[PDB]
């Protein structure tokens, strides 16, 4: 392809339907987006296990063999943003102890198996942006106590079950904006700490989520494009660190005199 002095080989621009053969087992990064890899062969990456970034994008990746990712203990960032694989790969992923960023957003995702995200201990960010999910994965997320960012942006989630985000105490920023959340239970966020950003932008909420006051750390709070009529008095009480509340584009009726104190 095109080797770089930074050990960042970019093979985007060959259109090849397999892994780049003959490449030195010394490279660190690998970018392949122009090409179309309809299937990842078994142990196709055994040649160069000394990589840390794997930019596999835009490929119509429909299948990835369970053993295909074995032995990549030096991999740090895995990017699979635009693909066609349906279910989250729970067997290919399981076996990575140095992975920090798992991007699986554009590939349509209807289901996610229970044992998914097992053994991952260095995960800090993972994207699930545009894929038709309907239930927030509770047990699957319970195995990730070390992440600091999680986006569920474009899905068809309906509601957040109680204690759906409990184990991942080290979370920082959450995104749930452009889906269609209908109502939240009053214990959905219980257990979340040092959370800063929370987005509920376009999901139409009924009246107001009272579960916000469960987190003592909070700086932003995005809920604007939804349909909120009345904000109850003293709603922003347990979160005295707010600095930006996006509440435009709501048919508000009665904010209430006691609605903003010591912010």
């Amino acid at each position, epitope marked *: 392809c095109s080797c770089d002095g930074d050990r960042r080989v970019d093979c985007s621009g060959k259109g090849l339907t397999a892994v780049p053969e003959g490449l030195s087992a010394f490279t660190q990064a690998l970018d392949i987006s122009m090409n179309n890899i309809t299937q990842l062969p078994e142990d196709a990456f055994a040649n160069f296990p000394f990589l840390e970034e794997l930019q596999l994008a835009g490929n119509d990746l429909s299948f990835i*063999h369970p053993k295909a990712l074995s032995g990549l203990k030096e991999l740090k960032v895995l990017t699979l943003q635009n693909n066609q694989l*349906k*279910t989250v790969p729970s067997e290919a992923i399981r076996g990575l102890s140095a992975l920090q960023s798992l991007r699986l957003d554009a590939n349509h995702i209807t289901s996610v*198996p*229970e*044992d998914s995200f097992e053994g991952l201990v260095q995960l800090r960010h993972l994207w699930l942006d545009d894929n038709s999910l309907t239930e927030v994965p509770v047990h699957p997320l319970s195995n990730l106590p070390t992440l600091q960012a999680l986006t569920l942006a474009l899905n068809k989630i309906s509601s957040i079950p109680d204690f759906a985000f409990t184990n991942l105490s080290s979370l920082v920023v959450l995104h749930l904006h452009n889906n269609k959340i209908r109502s939240l239970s009053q214990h959905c966020f219980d257990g979340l700490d040092n959370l800063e950003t929370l987005d509920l932008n376009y999901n139409n909420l009924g009246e107001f989520p009272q579960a916000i006051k469960a987190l003592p750390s909070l700086k932003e709070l995005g809920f604007h494009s939804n349909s909120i009529s009345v904000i109850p008095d003293g709603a922003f009480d347990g979160n005295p660190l707010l600095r930006t509340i996006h509440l435009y584009d709501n048919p508000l009726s009665f904010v209430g005199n006691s609605a903003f104190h010591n912010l």
Partner: nanobody
Amino acid sequence: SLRLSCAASGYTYSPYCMGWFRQAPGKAREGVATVDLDGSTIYADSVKGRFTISQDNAKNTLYLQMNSLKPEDTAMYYCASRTRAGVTCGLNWAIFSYWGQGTQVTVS
């Protein structure tokens, strides 16, 4: 009207979520029939009443029988198995750890 047998030698015993996958040459691969250790089977919409699935834990051998052959059914069929439990069954390729070499199947 074919016999598709999967000689299970990978694990030692206790089969779990034995499933058959047909692969189309250019598209993804999806399941057609999956049985569990208890014997419960899950087919697809285009398979219920057309094919079947048979598995014996005594000889530890997976059997697949085709019926009502049709031209669209011709594909590259694969055998899949799972050892570690903890996942609900279903026609999904993300939950199986061992994949057979696969056989190409036509109609006549």
